[PDB]
Amino acid sequence: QASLLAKKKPCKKRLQNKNSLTNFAVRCRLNPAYKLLRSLAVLRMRKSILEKSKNKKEKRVQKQIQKKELQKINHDYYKGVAKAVKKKKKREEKKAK
């Protein structure tokens, strides 16, 4: 009896699984940080429209320089395509005669 190793305990009867995304307790139990992240998301969310409404103009205004630069990149892309059409056109025109 003294020699025998201590009693071991049998495997666990199957409950209904509990949802790992929408059951709040279950999710928190799985992931400890989730509560902080949700609360942070709610805290950002709370903030009403006035600040956003003034700010949007500022966001657009500081984008302007980027907007010009981007317009140039796409403008260049188009020009290259047009040039290819002209080069092919001369080639075809030469070929025809």
Partner: protein, 223 residues
């Protein structure tokens, strides 16, 4: 005994605390990477030059096709790949070797690159894990941490969030973590497929092969 119960509570507290700090550090990393990619692309636009993003490192592969009438090599590759039952999904580590094997089974599988949201959702909602003794595993839905704190305790990547972190951008402890999960048994797509008959790149309706980014949209329909 009283000390052992007390000690157990202390271990339990330490683990939850440890996991939380790692979780926060991961969360900080993800946003930092995402923001930096945006900044890099804009920098490339600014000068004359192109940035290129890495090949995506992981690949989620979904099987598309029945048991019957399968070529013998293709069947063998499938067994190694680990997609048996017909809508089974698994993550695979992109390499050269894996990609070639994937190429052999290509007309029979869709596949692509996950994105973080897709991994997180899939791992919670449809993850099952291998519980039992060596090569006699038995399939248990994840549910709570003590299961994974057993097997991945040695490799220091325990915590379900920690499993998301290892998978999403290939961490060092990949082979065990992928192995440890049971293969994803998936439900069909809500608006159906278009044709298991053809490739996605065939200009018809069609579905097989590489779908890169778009795999997530498909996964979201069929979760």
């Amino acid at each position: 005994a009283a000390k052992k119960i007390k000690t157990l509570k202390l271990i339990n507290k330490k683990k939850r605390n440890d996991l939380r700090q790692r979780t926060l550090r991961y969360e900080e990393e993800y946003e930092s990477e995402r923001k930096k990619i945006i900044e890099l692309k804009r920098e490339a636009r600014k000068n004359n030059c192109f940035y290129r993003e890495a090949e995506k490192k992981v690949v989620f592969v979904i099987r598309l096709k029945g048991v019957n009438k399968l070529p013998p090599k293709v069947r063998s590759v499938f067994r190694l790949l680990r997609l048996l039952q017909v809508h089974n999904g698994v993550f695979v580590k992109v390499n050269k070797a894996t990609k070639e094997m994937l190429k052999i089974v290509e007309p029979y599988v869709t596949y692509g690159y996950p994105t973080l949201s897709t991994v997180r959702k899939l791992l919670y909602k449809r993850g099952y894990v291998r519980v039992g003794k060596v090569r006699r595993y038995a399939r248990k839905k994840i549910q709570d941490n003590a299961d994974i704190s057993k097997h991945l305790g040695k490799y220091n990547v325990h915590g379900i969030e920690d499993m998301v972190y290892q998978l999403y951008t290939c961490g060092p402890v990949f082979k065990k973590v992928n192995n440890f999960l049971w293969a994803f048994k998936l439900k069909p797509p809500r608006k159906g497929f278009k044709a298991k008959r053809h490739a996605f790149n065939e200009p018809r309706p069609g579905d097989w092969g590489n779908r890169e980014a778009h795999i997530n949209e498909l996964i979201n329909r069929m979760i």
